[PDB]
From a paper:
We solved the crystal structure of the complex containing the central domain of human MAT1 (66–141) and the Arch domain of XPD (245–439). Native crystals diffracted up to 2.07 Å and belong to space group P212121. The final model was refined to R-factors of 0.192/0.227 (Rwork/Rfree) containing two Arch/MAT1 heterodimers in the asymmetric unit. Within MAT1 residues 66–129 are visible, the last 12 residues seem to be disordered. For the Arch domain residues 246–439 can be observed in both monomers with residues 294–316 and 291–316 being disordered in monomer A and B, respectively. Notably, the two molecules in the asymmetric unit show a domain swap between the Arch domain monomers where the two central β-strands of the Arch domain base, which is composed of an antiparallel 4 β-strand motif, are exchanged. MAT1 contains three α-helices which form a helical-bundle: two (α1 and α2) helices interact with the Arch domain and the third (α3) packs above them and thereby stabilizes the fold. The Arch domain comprises a total of six α-helices and engages with MAT1 via α3 and the loop structure between α4 and α5. The overall surface area covered upon complex formation encompasses 727 Å2 and mainly involves charged interactions. The interface is thus characterized by a significant charge complementarity between the negatively charged MAT1 and the positively charged Arch domain.
TFIIH is a multi-protein complex that is involved in RNA polymerase II (Pol II) mediated transcription and nucleotide excision DNA repair (NER). TFIIH consists of ten subunits of which p8, p34, p44, p52, p62, XPB, and XPD belong to the core complex (core TFIIH) whereas MAT1, CDK7, and Cyclin H comprise an additional module, the CDK activating kinase complex (CAK). The main anchor point for the CAK complex on core TFIIH is the Arch domain of XPD15. Here, we present the high-resolution crystal structure of the Arch domain of human XPD in complex with the central domain of MAT1 providing an atomic resolution model of this important regulatory interaction.
Residue numbers in the entry:
A (entry chain A): 246 to 294, 316 to 439
B (entry chain D): 66 to 130
The structure:
Amino acid sequence: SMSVNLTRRTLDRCQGNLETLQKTVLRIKETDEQRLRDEYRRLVEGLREQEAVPGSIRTAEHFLGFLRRLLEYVKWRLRVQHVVQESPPAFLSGLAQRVCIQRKPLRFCAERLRSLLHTLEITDLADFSPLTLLANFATLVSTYAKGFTIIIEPFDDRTPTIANPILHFSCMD
Amino acid sequence: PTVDKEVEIRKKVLKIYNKREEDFPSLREYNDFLEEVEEIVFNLTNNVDLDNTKKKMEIYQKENK
Ligand SMILES: [Cl-]
């Protein structure tokens, strides 16, 4: 659900996954670049399944480099000798400081990974369950970093002559 | 290239290409800028088209002093 556990061994399997993906992308660059251009066109100007994919993770290779920097940050953080607890904003602040990853592209990580796996036509999906777990972590920690808030508006702007107050429960405050 | 090399190259580039989302009048222009930054980092990291890339960085840095 909204919980994710990442073990050191899981991250080792993610590193294996990224190795595989990188070799596949190099092969496709040598054999069939059109598939990559088609994915790019879909991401920047076409069908997805709101906000545009951030320009830092549009191409397959830029996104793979992004995932390597994320993985390396997370591996670094796990070299503790005692329990550590911190807020999502502190984790993201360390991420930005150490490997230059910002919160917004993190939001897109799971979808971008699903697109990349579909584009490389990788048939088996369980093969990449560790990397997907990392992508999910990236999305959850970025999306829900500031927790939730309740906003009560005394009336709806659409119908300003009636008393139709609105309660909003959502992220980002 | 190691990830450590990629990161140091990226930090150097971002010291020059240091604009944030609120520095662009439109999201489209911001995202194009982000993709341009990726192209520069990739070139410097993989030693590709180095002269034209560092030429580009010098021009950008002069225009954004
Ligand atoms: Cl954001």
